[PDB]
Ligand binder design. Structure first.
Ligand code: NI
Ligand code: NI
Lengths: 122, 122
């Protein structure tokens, strides 16, 4: 129970259009983590269907470059950089590269979970 | 409010020996996330000082390859994969590459914080 390794390539995946999504529910972590998580990969020139949800979402780009449209704003997020989406903000994630796959790790959580956590730190 | 980005290269840094650590305390996120976070980078042929803490720690390998020693056992975690350290497991992170920098994004939380979170969604 000391450490677990999680592999983007060997995990079970589903496809949203052509985006490969690896959801962490498959790993049966239960409540050990105060959030849910996934990897997703976007083919070159592709983009995610518009997404909107009460959970905040923190994303780290582990390969390629993301162009994230939130409202009337495009944010460019290169490999290594991160972005945080506030609750219920609609968003589209775009891979404008012609040859490089965009892969992202996302953690996401309901606002109540985060405030319940921090009050325990009090 | 809607959307924030975070930059690995320009974030404020401190050094633990020769490891560059970018702590997310500097972004003033307060209570929005149910965990703390950081990037750290390990130079080639270097390793972290032995670390042990009550927080669980989820680490994504953003660049390079990690060799994680937990207790007596070495685990290799290539680019893009994740590892999860259980509470109070002593760990050392080595970069055995001759030339490629290892960069890791880590999120960490106390067990009580994850208990208090999920009991709020009950
Ligand atoms: Ni989303
Ligand atoms: Ni640690």
């Amino acid at each position: 129970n000391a450490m677990r390794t999680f592999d983007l390539v060997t995990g079970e995946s589903l496809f949203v259009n052509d985006l490969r999504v690896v959801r962490w529910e498959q790993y049966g972590l239960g409540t050990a983590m105060p959030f849910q998580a996934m990897w997703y990969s976007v083919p070159p020139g592709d983009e995610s269907p518009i997404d909107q949800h009460p959970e905040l979402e923190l994303s780290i780009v582990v390969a390629g470059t993301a162009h994230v449209t939130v409202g009337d704003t495009v944010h460019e997020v290169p490999h290594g950089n991160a972005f945080l989406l506030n609750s219920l903000e609609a968003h589209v994630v775009q891979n404008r590269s012609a040859d490089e796959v965009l892969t992202v790790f996302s953690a996401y959580w309901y606002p109540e979970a985060a405030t319940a956590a921090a009050e325990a730190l009090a």
